[PDB]
């Protein structure tokens, strides 16, 4: 289904590589996701970066391979509760969803695509969107990040 | 000689010690003779003996004792013949000393345990 | 790759070696996945002819996150006649596997085809009865105390007194092989003399310890015991090794010397219930390698102990999970091994021990108020009383206090 | 003070959130004196919280010096200085500095100070020779652009 | 508590052991301490508990330090030392669990043991290999191969640049492959690959066998064929056999490699059994020139701890590294550690810095077969060693050190396609 890698406590000891994504929220809505800077210019040495647009909120994510692969068009969406967004079971915890707007076109039947739901923002299977003939989406979910816990 | 006679050395639990008596040729200092004994009987930095103590023989003119330490590694495990060539092989022929006699040897536990010892010993023999 | 090492429909062949493991998977890891992994790591990690297969997985009743897995291994993967190779393959590195929190080996089914490549006990139960000319009862023995600090002469005297007094065997302390205060050559001479001057009018012996640092030294000691006419020797197989044990067992068969095996380290390997190798596995492995006697320890879980005692004595044991026997084991007429009960026992407990173990056993006891010969007497009397009573059909658990020459009385009066 | 390529997964020991406000050298001490000191990852969302907003944000992967900084974290862009254009230009730079460790105590340790134009890095001993017992930040690491080759 | 003396100073000839335990509820640490000493030793012959320090953090978890007189041990025998210390002390009711953490062997006892047949410095001289760690690998497929095809795989791997190739620890002699044939074809592979490179190469022929006699026959044949090194499983086969083989090796000049199969059975859990560092010391005394230690990157401190214990002449106690007692090895030669498990060239930087030069790295699937495999590892190692000599930081620059080397080597460039 959706690839889910959970951030864990104590992971701050030695990250060799890390990536940065702008942050959008369920309350902020689809508009914020359109507003977020897509191209983050890497003029980096050990990371120095500039963004095409100024953005208030930034999440620092480890260079997990799916997140690293995205590059441009990478965004993180904050959800207060996991259950509403996740088609499957939830742990009643805040959810971070990484989405690639570059692949927003629905081509992957099993692929999950962030879309604007009537209630708010939801992750929808591609096949389901194809059944409703929705050719485009906000972003294609690449990874779901779960919070550190005890 | 200053690399062999060291007046402020404390022997280690694993050192082999030997006590010698000697009478130096006339005009030979006791300390120099002691240093020489240590050198002749060992390499001559961890393969050399050290003379740690020299004292006169009470009541005897031109006669001294010298106490020399030797590192454990200079001796073949389990071998009397090796211990003896190392200690008494040629030191007795050394020119600056009129005469030399070996009085005693301290064998460290670490070396004693590499030897067989008596085939039976006192208690076993009585039982046999 | 993760799967296909788990095939639920597979039915084991008569020539397969089967093993039963208990495990607890790391959270997030499925039971089946873990089972397949055990089979892979223990066999491959025409390959289909050289891989193990997990054929059955089931939960451990009453335990959370605890499962059993049953894995078959092709006959071709095991060196003929070698315990060392069997273990090297099966328990070599699977226990270090990352997806499992803990792993314990509960049982092994040795196919007849493999059993027949092993020597088995040098003599076995029936041969030993005939060699010793001792029938109709359990055999008795004891250890000698003081343990350390005795001269060979004094040691020999203690041995003498105990054997003359009525025991069949006297045992060397496991911690004395050769020591600065006592050298084996003299212990052997003085013990042999004690046997000579006692051997009564019946065969007696002493479990001389021939455990040694090298294979050559071990033989040297064993050869001396043979020259002195010693009927039995002992060895600490879990501290010395199976290679050494097997060598000694072959020597023993050729020279007619009974072999006593002392567990001597098993608590390190089999004590905890959720990790390591169950004793019953080691017991089977030993029966294949060699040894006529094996310490089993006492009973006085009970079911588990009874289980392996049958496994190492009987010719054919039906599977019975309530006794810890997972697989039916056919020993193909290989001779059995006498269990040796020990630790925490006295004449007081003789009734139970006789009823629990039957006749094919040895009972070793650790003092009596009057020297040692009365000790030996008290045990000899207590045992005969128990055997005769059992023969009469008496209840040795209920009548045990009635079933049990003031030597025995002194022991019973003390406790 | 290590110099590390931005390279992925060199050491395999655990990966997570760290952030530094970025300054340009041309900006000078004023930007450093104003960048937010406390950058606190929390809640469960883990979106980082800064006591004050900053224009440019860069993160330095949690290598050991970066993790050690905590408060006072800052990142300083440095730009070169070629006599000959054909001679290859030196790469752009970034300095991870602990503003909390402003005081100059280590002779070996480099310390951020102000050049006539832009900022500069000076040895602790040199700063003590010049009688400056204070610096803006203490440099804890050095740069180098990712080189896939 | 007649076996517990709160104020006692050990003699230089005493053997010391450090145990960790958890008492049954109702049993004071003091009693458990005394009990361990009593059960393991039984006045001149009794052990004495002299310190019962609690372990920080854990509840109902304590240490016990027990001294044992020199005269309780047989000269030269590991089998005896272990029987005396760990035979039945792990089996009594007063304690829920017991683990042995460390042993201090007094000089007086260390000198009665042979030690490694050759040791680290001699082994380098015999092989004429200096400056760098040594490399090796194993062969896949493991099971089901003919001796000849096996020999070809050995030839290619060694010809390609490895120093050693290792037999599957699980294959001694089996119906599909007999040991005599394997030994002949492997030996040929070595002789050819050696002749074509001008440098000594070996193969860890497995001489593990069911009996002491068979073990010697296998070892003798390897000697006849001119094989520089053999291997044996010290835990499954056991110490009596291992010691015998080590003596043979010294007399004959054959290096001995020790595999640690089944160690997990004894030391995997952290609250019961015998810690590997104890087994490592015991092995150094019994014999063996090379020993599998296992890798770090494919506890770090405790691993480094025993690696020093088996290589250095003198190790100061340091609880943070798992070393409880200062150990003076009395000039006995060390044992060369062998790193393994989950390793390939990406980890080469770390492995070189972690273990230093006195080590062997046993790798392993290369895209272009075995010789390219060997080539890639040979290059990656030399590149790392040289960078370390220059002063480059292998834990940070390691990615670049490998990529620069990869550009130079098509084999390495392929190997790094990860």
Swiss-Prot record, chain C:
Gene that produces this protein: cbbL
Catalytically driven reaction(s): 2 (2R)-3-phosphoglycerate + 2 H(+) = D-ribulose 1,5-bisphosphate + CO2 + H2O; D-ribulose 1,5-bisphosphate + O2 = 2-phosphoglycolate + (2R)-3-phosphoglycerate + 2 H(+)
Domain free text: Binding of RbcS probably induces a conformation change that displaces RbcX2 and triggers the final mature conformation.
Modified residues annotated as N6-carboxylysine in this record: 171
Protein name, UniProt field: Ribulose bisphosphate carboxylase large chain
Additional note from the record: RuBisCO folding and assembly commences when the nascent large subunit folds with the help of the chaperonin GroEL-GroES. Monomers require chaperone RbcX2 to assemble into RbcL8 octamers yielding RbcL8-(RbcX2)8. RbcX2 is displaced by RbcS; as RbcX2 is removed RbcS mediates the ordering of an internal RbcL loop (Thr-64-Leu-70) in a catalytically active conformation.
Subunit structure: Heterohexadecamer of 8 large chains and 8 small chains; disulfide-linked. The disulfide link is formed within the large subunit homodimers. The exposed C-terminus binds in a cleft in the RbcX2 (shown with endogenous and Anabaena strain CA protein). RbcX2 is displaced by RbcS; as RbcX2 is removed RbcS mediates the ordering of an internal RbcL loop (Thr-64-Leu-70) in a catalytically active conformation.
GO cellular component assignments: carboxysome
Tagged with keyword Metal-binding: yes
NCBIfam families registered for this protein in UniProt: PRK04208.1
Cofactor binding mode and count: Binds 1 Mg(2+) ion per subunit.
Taxonomy of the source species: Bacteria, Bacillati, Cyanobacteriota, Cyanophyceae, Synechococcales
Residues the record marks as active site: 145 (proton acceptor), 262 (proton acceptor)
Binding residue positions for substrate: 93, 143, 147, 263, 295, 342
Residues binding Mg(2+), per UniProt: 171, 173-174
Role according to the record: RuBisCO catalyzes two reactions: the carboxylation of D-ribulose 1,5-bisphosphate, the primary event in carbon dioxide fixation, as well as the oxidative fragmentation of the pentose substrate in the photorespiration process. Both reactions occur simultaneously and in competition at the same active site.
Location (main, coarse): other
Keywords assigned: Bacterial microcompartment, Calvin cycle, Carbon dioxide fixation, Carboxysome, Disulfide bond, Lyase, Magnesium, Metal-binding, Monooxygenase, Oxidoreductase, Photorespiration, Photosynthesis
PTM comment: The disulfide bond which can form in the large chain dimeric partners within the hexadecamer appears to be associated with oxidative stress and protein turnover.
Subcellular location(s) of the protein: Carboxysome
PROSITE patterns documented for this protein: RUBISCO_LARGE (PS00157)
SUPFAM superfamilies: RuBisCo, C-terminal domain (SSF51649), RuBisCO, large subunit, small (N-terminal) domain (SSF54966)
Family: Belongs to the RuBisCO large chain family. Type I subfamily.
Cofactor(s) listed in the protein's UniProt record: Mg(2+)
Swiss-Prot record, chain D:
Region (C-terminal beta sheet): 1-146
Top-level taxon in the UniProt lineage: Eukaryota
Subcellular location per the Swiss-Prot or TrEMBL entry: Plastid, Chloroplast
Domain notes: Has 3 domains, the N-terminal alpha-helical domain, an extended flexible linker and the C-terminal beta-sheet domain. The N-terminal alpha-helical domain stabilizes RbcL dimers and RbcL dimer-dimer interactions, facilitating RbcL(8) formation. The C-terminal beta-sheet domain probably dimerizes Raf1. The 2 C-terminal beta-sheet domains are swapped and pack against each other to form the dimer interface.
Family under the similarity heading: Belongs to the RAF family.
Oligomeric form and interacting partners: Homodimer.
Described purpose of this protein according to its UniProt entry: Required for assembly or stability of RuBisCO. Acts at a postchaperonin step to fold and/or assemble the large subunit (rbcL) into RuBisCO. RAF1 brackets an rbcL dimer (rbcL(2)), leading to rbcL(8)-RAF1(4) complex formation. In the next step, RBCS displaces RAF1, thus resulting in holoenzyme formation.
Full protein name: Rubisco accumulation factor 1.2, chloroplastic
Species of origin: Arabidopsis thaliana (Mouse-ear cress)
Protein encoded by which gene: RAF1.2
Boundaries of the shown chain within the full protein: 288 to 437 of 449
């Amino acid at each position: 289904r959706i690839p889910v890698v959970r951030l864990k406590f104590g992971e701050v000891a030695e990250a060799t590589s890390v990536v940065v994504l702008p942050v959008c929220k369920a309350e902020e809505g689809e508009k914020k996701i359109l507003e977020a800077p897509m191209e983050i210019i890497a003029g980096g040495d050990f990371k120095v970066v500039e963004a095409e647009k100024g953005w208030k909120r930034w999440v620092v994510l480890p260079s997990w391979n799916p997140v690293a692969a995205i590059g441009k068009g990478g965004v993180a969406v904050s959800f207060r509760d996991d259950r509403k967004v996740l088609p499957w079971d939830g742990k009643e915890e805040p959810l971070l969803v990484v989405a690639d707007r570059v692949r927003n076109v629905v081509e992957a039947d099993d692929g999950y695509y962030l879309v604007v739901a009537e209630n708010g923002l939801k992750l929808e299977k591609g096949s389901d969107l194809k059944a409703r003939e929705v050719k485009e989406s906000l972003g294609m979910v690449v990874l779901v990040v779960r919070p550190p816990r005890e | 000689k200053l690399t062999y006679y060291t007046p402020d050395y404390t022997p280690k639990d694993t050192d082999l010690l030997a006590a010698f008596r000697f009478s130096p040729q006339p005009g030979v200092p006791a300390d120099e003779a002691g240093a020489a004994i240590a050198a002749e009987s060992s390499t001559g930095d961890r393969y050399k003996g050290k003379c740690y103590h020299i004292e006169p023989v009470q009541g005897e003119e031109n006669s001294y004792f010298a106490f020399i330490a030797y590192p454990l590694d200079l001796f073949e495990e389990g071998s009397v013949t090796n211990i003896l060539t190392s200690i008494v092989g040629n030191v007795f022929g050394f020119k600056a000393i009129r005469s030399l006699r070996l009085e005693d040897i301290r064998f460290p536990v670490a070396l004693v345990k590499t030897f067989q010892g008596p085939p039976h010993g006192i208690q076993v023999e009585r039982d046999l | 790759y993760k799967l296909t090492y788990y095939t639920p429909d597979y039915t084991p062949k008569d020539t397969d070696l089967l093993a039963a493991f208990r495990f607890s998977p790391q959270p997030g890891v499925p039971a089946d996945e873990a089972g397949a992994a055990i089979a892979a790591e223990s066999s491959t990690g025409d390959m289909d002819r050289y891989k193990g297969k997990c054929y059955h997985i089931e939960p451990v009743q009453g335990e959370e996150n605890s499962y059993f897995a049953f894995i078959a291994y092709p006959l071709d993967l095991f060196e003929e006649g070698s315990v060392t190779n069997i273990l090297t393959s099966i328990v070599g590195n699977v226990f270090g596997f990352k997806a499992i929190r803990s792993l314990r080996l509960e049982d092994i089914r040795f196919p007849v085809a493999l059993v027949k490549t092993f020597q088995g006990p040098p003599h076995g139960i029936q041969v030993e009865r005939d060699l010793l000319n001792k029938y109709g009862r359990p055999m008795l023995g004891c250890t000698i105390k003081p343990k350390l600090g005795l001269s060979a002469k004094n040691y020999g005297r203690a041995v003498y007194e105990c054997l003359r007094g009525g025991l069949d065997f006297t045992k060397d302390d496991e911690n004395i092989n050769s020591q600065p205060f006592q050298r084996w050559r003299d212990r052997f001479l003085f013990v042999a003399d004690a046997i000579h001057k006692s051997q009564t009018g019946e065969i007696k012996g002493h479990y001389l310890n021939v455990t040694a640092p090298t294979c050559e030294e071990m033989m040297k000691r064993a050869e001396f015991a043979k020259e002195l006419g010693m009927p039995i020797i002992m060895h600490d197989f879990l501290t010395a090794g199976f290679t050494a044990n097997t060598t000694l067992a072959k020597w023993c068969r050729d020279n007619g010397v009974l072999l006593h095996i002392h567990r001597a380290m098993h608590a390190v390997i089999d004590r905890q219930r959720n990790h390591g190798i169950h004793f019953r596995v080691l017991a089977k492995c030993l029966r294949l390698s060699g040894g006529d006697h094996l310490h089993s320890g006492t009973v006085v879980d009970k079911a588990s102990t009874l289980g392996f005692v049958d496994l190492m004595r009987e010719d054919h044991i039906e599977a019975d999970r309530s006794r810890g026997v997972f697989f039916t084991q056919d020993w193909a007429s290989m001779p059995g091994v006498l269990p040796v009960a020990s630790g925490g026992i006295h004449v007081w407990h003789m009734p139970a021990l006789v009823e629990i173990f039957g006749d094919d056993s040895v009972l070793q006891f650790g003092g009596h108020p009057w020297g040692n010969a009365p000790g030996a007497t008290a045990n000899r009397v207590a045992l005969e009383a128990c055997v005769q009573a059992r023969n009469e059909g008496r209840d040795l658990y209920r009548e045990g206090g009635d079933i049990l020459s003031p030597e025995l009385a002194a022991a019973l009066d003390l406790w």
